[PDB]
Structures are given as C-alpha cells and as structure tokens.
Amino acid sequence: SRKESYAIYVYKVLKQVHPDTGISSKAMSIMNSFVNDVFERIAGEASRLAHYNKRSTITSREIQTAVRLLLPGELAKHAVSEGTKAVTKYTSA
C-alpha cells in the first residue's frame, strides 16, 4: 500500500539550492537510497556507542559522535555545525 520516501524533502532541498534545476526519477531514487544508507550508518554507530558506553538512550551527543566517526574530514565539521545549530534553534523555542 503506502510507501514512505524522501523524495519530497530531496526536492525541497534541491529547489532551495538550485532553484531552476529539476531531478530525474532514477536520480531521485539514488538520492533516496543515499539518505537511507547514511541514516542507517549514523543510527547504527549511535546504537553501538550507546551500548559500549553503558547507556540505554540515543541522545544528541551520541549522534554527534557517530557523525564525527563516520563522516570524513570537513564533512564531519560542517555536519556537526549544522546539527548543533538545528538543535539549539529547536530547543530555543
């Protein structure tokens, strides 16, 4: 029946980055698979971190350390900056 996807959000991001560029259906599926794969990597690393350290929950800092472990080089620095900015904006109001 219903199928969940990241297509609408990928398209929103694309329109806010390249306002005049569309995206094919195969490229949309590739981007969807990329988002799923990265989500799984970060979540699995966060689960492993929360199990090694004797914890039971996944917090913001578990995701931050998972991003720091998985993402290479400057991707990690910029992704950490974006995530912390989002969390501060969320909890501010």
């Binding site: 806010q16 195969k26 917090t59 995701i63 910029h78 909890t91």
Partner: protein, 107 residues
C-alpha cells in the same frame, strides 16, 4: 492549540517526526532522546544539500537542466570527501569518471 511541525520549529526541510519514528522502530536503543531526531535530520539535510549542489553544478557543466545518475556520480567522484564517504557504493547507471593513464597515451 495550533500545530507547528517539529521540522519547521527546527528550521529544517527534512522530516523530524519521520526520522524520530524510524529511530524508535529501528531497534537502535531502548530510548531515543528528543534532540536526536533533530540532529540526525539536520545532518541528513546537510549531506543531501551538499551532494545535490555538486550534482547541479555537474549538470550545468553539461548544459542540462535535470540531474541524472551520471551527474550524481560525477559529483560523488570528483569531491574527495564525498568520494571517501561513498567508497564502496555503486551509483547505478552512473558510468565511470573519465580518466586515462598517462602511460597509455601518445602524448
């Protein structure tokens, strides 16, 4: 009690609610913090924006208005960091990066 989406509150485009649900049902931990879905959604949106910005540049370099798998693969392989992240990943219908060894050339 007007409803404002968590994603809108966080200033993102990616779904905070869907990411939270996936983290919950995904069997990663018994409990999932409140800020964890927001952080993960922000990271995912950043990575998607990065690869799509490079893909849009690659598509424009070929004088085209649509992003196809080839442009995604060019964006991935030409950027060292994204190439390192997507190391073992195959981008289907994406071809290969044009490159010939200097030895195999009449100069």
């Amino acid at each position: 009690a007007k409803a404002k989406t968590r994603s809108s509150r966080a200033g993102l485009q990616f779904p905070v609610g869907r990411v939270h649900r996936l983290l919950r049902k995904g069997n990663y931990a018994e409990r999932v913090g409140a800020g964890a879905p927001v952080y993960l959604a922000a990271v995912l949106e950043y990575l998607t924006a990065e690869i799509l910005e490079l893909a849009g540049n690659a598509a424009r370099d070929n004088k085209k208005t649509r992003i196809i798998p080839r442009h995604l693969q060019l964006a991935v392989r030409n950027d060292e960091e994204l190439n390192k992240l997507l190391g073992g990943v195959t981008i289907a219908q994406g071809g290969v990066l044009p490159n010939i060894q200097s030895v195999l050339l009449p100069k």
